[PDB]
Amino acid sequence: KLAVSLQSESKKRYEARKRQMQNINDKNKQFNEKLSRES
RNA sequence: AAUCUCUUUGCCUUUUGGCUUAGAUCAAGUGUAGUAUCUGUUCUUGUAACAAGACCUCAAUGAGGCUC
């Protein structure tokens, strides 16, 4: 149950971060978003 | 196999990896210095008589059969 809990929580964290990711180039827009966070 | 999803924060989670004469130039009837080879013609009599792969045994498989 400990192993299953770690696996399932890892899956949940991983998929939540994927859903956040899904909302000129990928790196260039990530840099522009970082600059918008900076301001 | 026991919950799942959205917003707002926190984390940045594929989130700019040196230097110098901003390295230099927006460009030249080029000059200069090396390393090679050539290119091309062109090719080597007739007629008659007479004569003639299968199977078996031993065994690294070849020798023998008035054999076919």
Residue A23 per-residue DSSP state: -
In angstroms, the CA of A18 and the C1' of B41 are apart by 80
> Which strand B nucleotides have any atom less than 7 A from protein CB atoms?
1-2, 4-7, 12-16
Which tokens in the block code for residue A35? 């600059």
Three-state DSSP class for residue A39:
coil
Q: Which residue from A33, A35, A17 is spatially nearest to A25, judged by alpha carbons?
A: A33
Residue A39: count of CB within 10 angstroms of its CB: 4
Q: How far is CA A28 from CA A3, A6, A7, A11, in A?
A: 39, 34, 33, 28
In angstroms, the CA of A25 and the C1' of B23 are apart by 29
